[PDB]
Design an enzyme around this catalytic site. Structure first.
Site, PDB file in Angstrom:
ATOM      1  N   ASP A 196      48.332 -96.332  14.573  1.00 36.49           N
ATOM      2  CA  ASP A 196      48.007 -95.296  15.154  1.00 36.49           C
ATOM      3  C   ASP A 196      49.201 -94.261  16.324  1.00 36.49           C
ATOM      4  O   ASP A 196      49.202 -94.936  16.757  1.00 36.49           O
ATOM      5  CB  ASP A 196      46.309 -95.876  15.773  1.00 36.49           C
ATOM      6  CG  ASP A 196      45.681 -94.551  15.668  1.00 36.49           C
ATOM      7  OD1 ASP A 196      46.134 -94.109  16.282  1.00 36.49           O
ATOM      8  OD2 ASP A 196      44.066 -95.608  14.864  1.00 36.49           O
TER       9      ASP A 196
ATOM     10  N   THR B 258      41.086 -90.810  14.758  1.00 32.17           N
ATOM     11  CA  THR B 258      41.443 -91.610  13.792  1.00 32.17           C
ATOM     12  C   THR B 258      40.610 -91.801  12.598  1.00 32.17           C
ATOM     13  O   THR B 258      41.038 -92.125  11.559  1.00 32.17           O
ATOM     14  CB  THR B 258      41.244 -92.471  14.718  1.00 32.17           C
ATOM     15  OG1 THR B 258      42.536 -92.583  16.182  1.00 32.17           O
ATOM     16  CG2 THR B 258      41.529 -94.210  13.873  1.00 32.17           C
TER      17      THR B 258
ATOM     18  N   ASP C 191      49.208 -95.667  19.976  1.00 29.79           N
ATOM     19  CA  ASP C 191      48.133 -94.272  20.328  1.00 29.79           C
ATOM     20  C   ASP C 191      47.689 -94.887  21.827  1.00 29.79           C
ATOM     21  O   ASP C 191      47.341 -94.303  22.356  1.00 29.79           O
ATOM     22  CB  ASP C 191      47.035 -94.731  18.710  1.00 29.79           C
ATOM     23  CG  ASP C 191      45.983 -93.560  19.691  1.00 29.79           C
ATOM     24  OD1 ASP C 191      45.712 -93.076  19.617  1.00 29.79           O
ATOM     25  OD2 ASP C 191      44.748 -94.541  20.611  1.00 29.79           O
TER      26      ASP C 191
ATOM     27  N   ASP D 155      47.912 -91.374  11.404  1.00 28.33           N
ATOM     28  CA  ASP D 155      46.720 -90.330  11.757  1.00 28.33           C
ATOM     29  C   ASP D 155      47.351 -89.102  12.252  1.00 28.33           C
ATOM     30  O   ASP D 155      45.983 -87.945  11.644  1.00 28.33           O
ATOM     31  CB  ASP D 155      45.419 -91.467  11.858  1.00 28.33           C
ATOM     32  CG  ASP D 155      45.500 -92.239  13.383  1.00 28.33           C
ATOM     33  OD1 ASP D 155      46.782 -92.104  13.962  1.00 28.33           O
ATOM     34  OD2 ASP D 155      44.844 -92.338  14.046  1.00 28.33           O
TER      35      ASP D 155
ATOM     36  N   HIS E 228      44.765 -86.326  21.605  1.00 23.12           N
ATOM     37  CA  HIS E 228      44.466 -85.816  20.275  1.00 23.12           C
ATOM     38  C   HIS E 228      43.356 -85.265  19.966  1.00 23.12           C
ATOM     39  O   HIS E 228      42.224 -85.801  20.487  1.00 23.12           O
ATOM     40  CB  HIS E 228      44.979 -86.558  19.256  1.00 23.12           C
ATOM     41  CG  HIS E 228      44.295 -87.824  18.930  1.00 23.12           C
ATOM     42  ND1 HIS E 228      44.051 -88.248  18.554  1.00 23.12           N
ATOM     43  CD2 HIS E 228      45.026 -89.077  19.949  1.00 23.12           C
ATOM     44  CE1 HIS E 228      43.401 -89.575  18.504  1.00 23.12           C
ATOM     45  NE2 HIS E 228      44.164 -89.988  19.530  1.00 23.12           N
TER      46      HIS E 228
HETATM   47 ZN   LIG Z   1      44.490 -92.518  15.524  1.00 24.22          ZN
HETATM   48 ZN   LIG Z   2      44.147 -92.059  19.451  1.00 29.32          ZN
END
Ligand SMILES: [Zn+2]
Ligand SMILES: [Zn+2]
Ligand SMILES: *[C@@H]1O[C@H](CO)[C@@H](O[C@@H]2O[C@H](CO)[C@@H](O[C@@H]3O[C@H](CO[C@H]4O[C@H](CO)[C@@H](O)[C@H](O)[C@@H]4O)[C@@H](O)[C@H](O[C@H]4O[C@H](CO)[C@@H](O)[C@H](O)[C@@H]4O)[C@@H]3O)[C@H](O)[C@H]2NC(C)=O)[C@H](O)[C@H]1NC(C)=O
Ligand SMILES: *[C@@H]1O[C@H](CO)[C@@H](O[C@@H]2O[C@H](CO)[C@@H](O)[C@H](O)[C@H]2NC(C)=O)[C@H](O)[C@H]1NC(C)=O
Ligand SMILES: *[C@@H]1O[C@H](CO)[C@@H](O[C@@H]2O[C@H](CO)[C@@H](O)[C@H](O)[C@H]2NC(C)=O)[C@H](O)[C@H]1NC(C)=O
Ligand SMILES: *[C@@H]1O[C@H](CO[C@@H]2O[C@@H](C)[C@@H](O)[C@@H](O)[C@@H]2O)[C@@H](O)[C@H](O)[C@H]1NC(C)=O
Ligand SMILES: *[C@@H]1O[C@H](CO)[C@@H](O)[C@H](O)[C@H]1NC(C)=O
Ligand SMILES: *[C@@H]1O[C@H](CO)[C@@H](O)[C@H](O)[C@H]1NC(C)=O
Ligand SMILES: [Zn+2]
Ligand SMILES: [Zn+2]
Length: 382
Positions: free
Chosen positions: A18, A54, A173, A220, A321
């Site tokens: 991620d 995500t 992430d 992602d 993000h």
């Molecule tokens: Zn993500």
């Molecule tokens: Zn995130």
């Protein structure tokens, strides 16, 4: 001496780390990522889907659809037909009707007689069209990477083996949010992710899968640096009583209360230069976002590196993000190794909507209607 080996069906393992921004490969030595590159394929610029969060982006990877089509338009949603909310943060994701505007590839794979396995992949432990992957784990972020790998390899080598696996890990992430992608601490987490990839490679080799599984390593979305000096505070412009905030930052999904639409739009549009306020019907066509009743009447989009806070106590993270998918910092890595893939090949760009058509081709499945094109990615193949 050289002898026959039984023809195996084609196999694919998709790994998502991620929030692995495309240029993280260069923040620290990444020998295991580079080992795949030297023996595989690499795409510099992967255009993912808006919003660059995500759940929308993982569902695009397994459907080939833009978010307005597969219906997972955000991590937090309100569906006015269902009169229900969906929220990742509350683990309130298991209402099948939020997923059923599309069909993920594991269902199509299994309708063709194969078995799929998922180890924490977003949405894979949700019942969709009355189906699960053949094998899956109930989502639990505390399960170690090594245990997830162990299950994947068990499933690829079972009495009745999978041909299609999905493996997911929450870094880089989580640390990117905590410290920001510009932090030198990102080197530590990227190095660790590279070590985990090396662990996966080692286990695939030990299980005699390395040269017969097509391993696809992607993500992602990326991550961008935020700052308390770059905040848009909605209560400086809007009466909190007059709207509901369905999703917060950096794409504020705003549902004005009865009769307060023009008040909310007028108060917010042009209020801040780094917050672009769209009426639903004005949303840019290139985002393929607006043709869905889960897109709220007003969508306010912060520019890269800006944070939307509803009031002074709203959440703030040094990395985030969700921004415009045209932005390079939102773009994920993509690399792959396997018998179907070229070796030591680099391609400049792909669309993440194309992966579904690539997977269907590799597994000899009939793709459901989608927004990608196999012809765009056929040059990755040997
Ligand atoms: Zn993500
Ligand atoms: Zn995130
Ligand atoms: C958040 O929102 C702010 C405010 O709207 C955005 O800031 C603007 O960004 C643009 C693009 O860079 C700026 O326009 C460019 O300004 C350059 C000069 O900058 C100085 O001078 C201006 C005064 O004229 C100040 O506002 C600025 O702060 C600096 O002091 C010009 O050189 C640019 O011209 C060149 O490029 C353009 C294309 O960008 C060409 O058309 C020209 O021909 C020329 O080659 C350009 O004019 C604008 O000044 C900024 N405004 C302000 C108030 O700062 C942020 O970009 C936005 N943040 C994010 C992340 O999107
Ligand atoms: C990503 O998808 C876009 C949209 O389909 C592609 O852009 C199109 O490219 C074709 C050529 O095959 C052109 O004829 C169209 O005019 C383009 N459409 C738009 C809206 O720009 C783009 O090529 C894809 N990128 C990659 C790397 O596959
Ligand atoms: C993305 O792909 C989907 C699936 O093919 C397209 O959705 C169809 O759009 C047509 C209109 O052209 C409708 O009649 C169908 O009902 C839609 N099907 C589904 C399953 O939603 C969609 O148009 C594509 N998007 C883009 C931008 O090309
Ligand atoms: C809609 O549903 C409400 C109860 O469900 C909760 O609220 C909705 C808005 C969603 O957030 C859902 O996920 C929640 O569980 C009812 O209280 C409300 O009266 C209903 N409204 C109408 C008009 O039927
Ligand atoms: C998740 O895994 C951990 C470690 O085995 C366990 O303690 C916990 O009960 C599991 N369930 C949830 C919902 O976290
Ligand atoms: C901000 O809004 C929250 C609701 O999420 C509220 O409980 C809180 O008291 C507010 N704080 C301030 C400082 O306005
Ligand atoms: Zn986490
Ligand atoms: Zn944290």
């Amino acid at each position: 001496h050289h002898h026959h080996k039984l023809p195996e069906e084609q196999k694919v393992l998709v790994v998502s780390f991620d929030g692995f921004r495309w240029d993280y490969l260069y923040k620290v030595p990444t020998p295991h990522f580079h080992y795949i590159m030297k023996n595989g394929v690499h795409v510099n610029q992967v255009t993912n889907v808006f919003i660059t969060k995500t759940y929308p982006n993982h569902y695009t990877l397994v459907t080939g659809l833009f978010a307005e089509n597969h219906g997972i338009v955000a991590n937090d949603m309100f569906d006015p037909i269902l009169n229900k909310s969906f929220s990742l943060e509350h683990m309130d994701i298991y209402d099948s009707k939020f997923w059923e505007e599309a069909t993920p590839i594991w269902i199509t794979n299994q309708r063709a007689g194969h078995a799929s396995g998922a180890a924490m992949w977003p949405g894979a432990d949700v019942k969709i069209h009355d189906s699960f992957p053949t094998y899956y784990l109930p989502y639990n972020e505390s399960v170690s990477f090594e245990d997830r790998v162990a299950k994947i390899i068990e499933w690829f080598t079972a009495k009745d083996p999978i041909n299609l696996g999905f493996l997911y890990w929450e870094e880089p992430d989580d640390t990117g949010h905590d410290v920001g992608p510009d932090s030198p601490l990102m080197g530590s987490v990227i190095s660790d992710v590279d070590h985990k990839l090396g662990y996966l490679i080692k286990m695939l080799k030990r299980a005699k899968l390395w040269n017969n599984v097509n391993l696809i390593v992607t993500s992602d979305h990326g991550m961008t640096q935020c700052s308390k000096q770059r905040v848009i505070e909605l209560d400086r412009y809007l009466d909190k009583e007059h709207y509901t905030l369905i999703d917060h930052s950096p794409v504020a999904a705003i549902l004005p209360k009865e009769g307060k639409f023009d008040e909310v739009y007028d108060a917010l549009a042009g209020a801040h230069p780094n917050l672009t306020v769209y009426k639903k019907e004005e949303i840019p066509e290139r985002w393929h976002y607006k043709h869905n009743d889960r897109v709220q009447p007003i969508v306010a989009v912060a520019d890269e590196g800006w944070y939307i806070l509803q009031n002074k106590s709203d959440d703030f993270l040094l990395g985030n993000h969700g921004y415009d998918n045209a932005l390079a910092e939102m773009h994920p890595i993509f690399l792959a190794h396997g018998p179907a893939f070229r070796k030591n090949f680099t391609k400049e760009a792909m669309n993440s909507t194309d992966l579904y058509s690539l997977l269907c081709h590799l597994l000899n499945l009939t793709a459901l209607p989608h927004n990608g094109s196999f012809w765009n990615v056929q040059d990755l193949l040997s």
